[PDB]
Amino acid sequence: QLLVPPPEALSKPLSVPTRLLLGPGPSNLAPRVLAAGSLRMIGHMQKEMLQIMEEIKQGIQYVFQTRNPLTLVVSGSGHCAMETALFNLLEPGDSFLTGTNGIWGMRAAEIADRIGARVHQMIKKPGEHYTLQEVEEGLAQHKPVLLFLVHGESSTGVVQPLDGFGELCHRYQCLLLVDSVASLGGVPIYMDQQGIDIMYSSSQKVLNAPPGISLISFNDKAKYKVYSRKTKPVSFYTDITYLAKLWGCEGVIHHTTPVTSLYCLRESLALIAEQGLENCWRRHREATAHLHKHLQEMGLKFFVKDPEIRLPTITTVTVPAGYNWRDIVSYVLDHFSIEISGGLGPTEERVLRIGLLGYNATTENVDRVAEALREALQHCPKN
Amino acid sequence: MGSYQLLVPPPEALSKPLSVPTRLLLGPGPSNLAPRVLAAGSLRMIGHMQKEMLQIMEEIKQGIQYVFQTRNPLTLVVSGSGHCAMETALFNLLEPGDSFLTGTNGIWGMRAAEIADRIGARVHQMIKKPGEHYTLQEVEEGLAQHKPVLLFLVHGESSTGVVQPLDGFGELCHRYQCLLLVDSVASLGGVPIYMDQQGIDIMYSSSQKVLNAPPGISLISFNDKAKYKVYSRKTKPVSFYTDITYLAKLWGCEGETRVIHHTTPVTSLYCLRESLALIAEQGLENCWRRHREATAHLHKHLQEMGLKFFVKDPEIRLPTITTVTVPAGYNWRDIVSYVLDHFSIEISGGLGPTEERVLRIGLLGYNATTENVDRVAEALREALQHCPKN
Numbered sequence: 001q002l003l004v005p006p007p008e009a010l011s012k013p014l015s016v017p018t019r020l021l022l023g024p025g026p027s028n029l030a031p032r033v034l035a036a037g038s039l040r041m042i043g044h045m046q047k048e049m050l051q052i053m054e055e056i057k058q059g060i061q062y063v064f065q066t067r068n069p070l071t072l073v074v075s076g077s078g079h080c081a082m083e084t085a086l087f088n089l090l091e092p093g094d095s096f097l098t099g100t101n102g103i104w105g106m107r108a109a110e111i112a113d114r115i116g117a118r119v120h121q122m123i124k125k126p127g128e129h130y131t132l133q134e135v136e137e138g139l140a141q142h143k144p145v146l147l148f149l150v151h152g153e154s155s156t157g158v159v160q161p162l163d164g165f166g167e168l169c170h171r172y173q174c175l176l177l178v179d180s181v182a183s184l185g186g187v188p189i190y191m192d193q194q195g196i197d198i199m200y201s202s203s204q205k206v207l208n209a210p211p212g213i214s215l216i217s218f219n220d221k222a223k224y225k226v227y228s229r230k231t232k233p234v235s236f237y238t239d240i241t242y243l244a245k246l247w248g249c250e251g252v253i254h255h256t257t258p259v260t261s262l263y264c265l266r267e268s269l270a271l272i273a274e275q276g277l278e279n280c281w282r283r284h285r286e287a288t289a290h291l292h293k294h295l296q297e298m299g300l301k302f303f304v305k306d307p308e309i310r311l312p313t314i315t316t317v318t319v320p321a322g323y324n325w326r327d328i329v330s331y332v333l334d335h336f337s338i339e340i341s342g343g344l345g346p347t348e349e350r351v352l353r354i355g356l357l358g359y360n361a362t363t364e365n366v367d368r369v370a371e372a373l374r375e376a377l378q379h380c381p382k383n
Numbered sequence: 384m385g386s387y388q389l390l391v392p393p394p395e396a397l398s399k400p401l402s403v404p405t406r407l408l409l410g411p412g413p414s415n416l417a418p419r420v421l422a423a424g425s426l427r428m429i430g431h432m433q434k435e436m437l438q439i440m441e442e443i444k445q446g447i448q449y450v451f452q453t454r455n456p457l458t459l460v461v462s463g464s465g466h467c468a469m470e471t472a473l474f475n476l477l478e479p480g481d482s483f484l485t486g487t488n489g490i491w492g493m494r495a496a497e498i499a500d501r502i503g504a505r506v507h508q509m510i511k512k513p514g515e516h517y518t519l520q521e522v523e524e525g526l527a528q529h530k531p532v533l534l535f536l537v538h539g540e541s542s543t544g545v546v547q548p549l550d551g552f553g554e555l556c557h558r559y560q561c562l563l564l565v566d567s568v569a570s571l572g573g574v575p576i577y578m579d580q581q582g583i584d585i586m587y588s589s590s591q592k593v594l595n596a597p598p599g600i601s602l603i604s605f606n607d608k609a610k611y612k613v614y615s616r617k618t619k620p621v622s623f624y625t626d627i628t629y630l631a632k633l634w635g636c637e638g639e640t641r642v643i644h645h646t647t648p649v650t651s652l653y654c655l656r657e658s659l660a661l662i663a664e665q666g667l668e669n670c671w672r673r674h675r676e677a678t679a680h681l682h683k684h685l686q687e688m689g690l691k692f693f694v695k696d697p698e699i700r701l702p703t704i705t706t707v708t709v710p711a712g713y714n715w716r717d718i719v720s721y722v723l724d725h726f727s728i729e730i731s732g733g734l735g736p737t738e739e740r741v742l743r744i745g746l747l748g749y750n751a752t753t754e755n756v757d758r759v760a761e762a763l764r765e766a767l768q769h770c771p772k773n
């Protein structure tokens with residue numbers, strides 16, 4: 001007799017319902033990504049896997065708008081690639097500065113504290129962005145080696161302007177690391193042209209691939225910082241000197257990269273390349289304008305008061321006065337099979353979040369969620 | 384749409400349809416997938432906090448508890464493939480200055496030693512030649528000498544083709560106030576393991592060896608003694624995202640939930656759930672039997688064609704990954720290429736200390752069959768006939 005018996009719960013067939021995911025992530029998968037999902041396995045070091053890896057690197061270079069050879073995939077979902085960036089870039093005692101205008105800057109600060117950096121934060125209210133003047137004041141005061149700036153603040157629905165920030169940092173002998181998890185593919189970014197030194201994103205937002213892999217790129221200035229270190233990064237597996245070899249970034253090793261995740265990412269990148277970035281950005285702007293018109297018509301208010309900093313991909317809507325937000329979210333799910341979310345970090349209990357991400361950024365999906373919200377407002381209990 | 388012109392053009396290579404050839408994967412991993420797991424790869428997405436996902440997470444925990452044979456409530460999934468979960472184990476278990484003991488008999492012990500050095504541990508290694516295992520006497524002498532807080536022991540040494548006996552090691556460690564961490568990445572599902580009954584305090588494995596489950600997630604479990612070491616830390620572990628004191632709350636491992644962001648690789652979980660369902664349906668005993676039978680059959684073929692085992696003692700030969708000494712006069716790359724080119728079968732060379740010294744043949748779950756053994760045996764006999772020899 002075995003200690004632990006076969007779980008009865010596993011004897012039932014796996015079933016996943018069909019829903020429209022209009023929250024902050026994960027997004028619905030595009031047909032090409034769906035098709036990729038049941039492809040057979042091949043060996044990690046085989047000719048065809050090496051070709052798929054090179055095509056993925058080219059695709060990431062295209063979406064990021066970078067020529068950086070140190071551009072690759074790391075395991076992990078959401079914003080966890082910040083750990084890969086920080087573990088490599090920061091040594092104990094290094095001065096680090098964050099744009100803490102939501103949960104992401106705060107999280108970067110927490111990680112940097114854990115590895116022994118001297119952590120400094122420019123704290124702003126949720127719903128605000130950073131000006132060049134504010135960042136220059138932070139650089140002057142703290143003299144950081146690295147600035148962390150969030151492009152798409154998915155906890156607050158904020159899009160951060162990127163022009164001029166990289167060169168401002170360079171004037172202070174500081175590198176610029178950008179988080180574009182919630183913005184990449186939906187908002188204009190030109191990594192090399194904007195002087196961004198390190199950037200990461202995820203597969204599950206605009207890219208419409210399954211969660212679990214992240215995209216990261218380091219320029220040679222950033223690689224120079226890593227090679228100047230007194231000590232090896234705390235993580236062997238996310239050490240850029242190991243990852244670079246694995247991904248053939250220096251003219252290759254043994255490793256277990258996630259094969260099926262690579263097939264899906266390859267297809268997601270192919271779809272963006274075929275549409276072209278300009279069309280992808282226009283499509284998100286167009287979907288968001290239509291959503292913002294419906295929200296205004298329903299009398300719902302925006303959490304972000306300045307229209308110019310509203311993130312096209314994820315909109316923060318102030319919870320309507322008198323309602324329980326959980327009833328609105330549950331009503332939309334039960335009656336329309338649409339997933340929307342509440343808040344995150346500083347916006348917990350304060351907002352609804354609606355995401356219009358890649359394949360889902362259509363005026364048709366906007367009409368579906370607008371209808372669902374209208375019905376929720378007339379039927380959910382009010383005070 | 385923005386303030387600059389696009390200067391990196393779309394890659395033309397991405398416009399070609401994505402296809403992959405049909406091959407039999409008999410290397411050290413990944414293995415070919417069972418039809419249910421393949422099918423689970425194309426399932427639709429759902430939200431991370433939704434009722435259906437929470438239920439899948441619950442069934443996965445139960446499934447891991449079953450394959451590990453543990454009642455530990457702190458049993459969950461972490462991101463990362465291969466043996467990466469050793470980082471999650473070591474970042475949580477070791478503080479700067481902690482004495483750490485490793486069974487360095489292949490690449491995995493060397494890897495644990497490196498990671499432990501990176502985090503400021505006082506690292507002590509019991510170095511043995513590739514192809515050997517640790518005796519209870521050897522481990523006791525290491526424990527006595529170094530007084531480690533943690534011993535790292537590799538169950539399935541996939542770089543050398545060695546299976547480590549586990550009976551008595553946990554109990555021995557506890558007499559020296561030491562925790563036992565076991566790596567079962569290459570052995571789980573194919574070799575008998577009884578986590579609680581063998582006194583294993585921490586164990587990890589991954590989903591792409593015997594489990595046949597993409598995309599490459601890790602399974603990990605900590606008992607109460609291991610939890611106590613983690614909560615007694617004077618400093619936070621280096622990773623927030625793999626901090627077990629936060630991940631335990633997320634996964635509902637203590638009754639007191641706090642939805643700290645962390646992660647959920649959804650398609651990953653679907654495939655893992657199905658793989659765990661297949662193993663539970665078949666039963667662990669039958670799974671272990673299938674591996675022994677397939678390996679026995681492979682070993683009989685190898686003996687008959689004159690190939691020599693890298694592991695001298697037959698009882699220490701890992702059923703799931705067999706190491707074969709490269710035969711004298713041949714270029715091992717020619718053998719591996721011949722098997723691929725003429726039979727569409729993937730086998731491998733060595734790893735770490737067995738690089739250039741061995742061939743590796745894996746029989747991992749779904750692929751651990753008689754027909755597959757017969758196929759690789761024919762491919763190997765023909766490679767020995769037709770590859771150039773000195």
Ligand SMILES: [Cl-]
Nearest residue numbers: 028029427428
């Ligand atoms: Cl979907």
Ligand SMILES: [Cl-]
Nearest residue numbers: 040041415416
């Ligand atoms: Cl397959």
Ligand SMILES: [Mg+2]
Nearest residue numbers: 290294366367
């Ligand atoms: Mg409309």
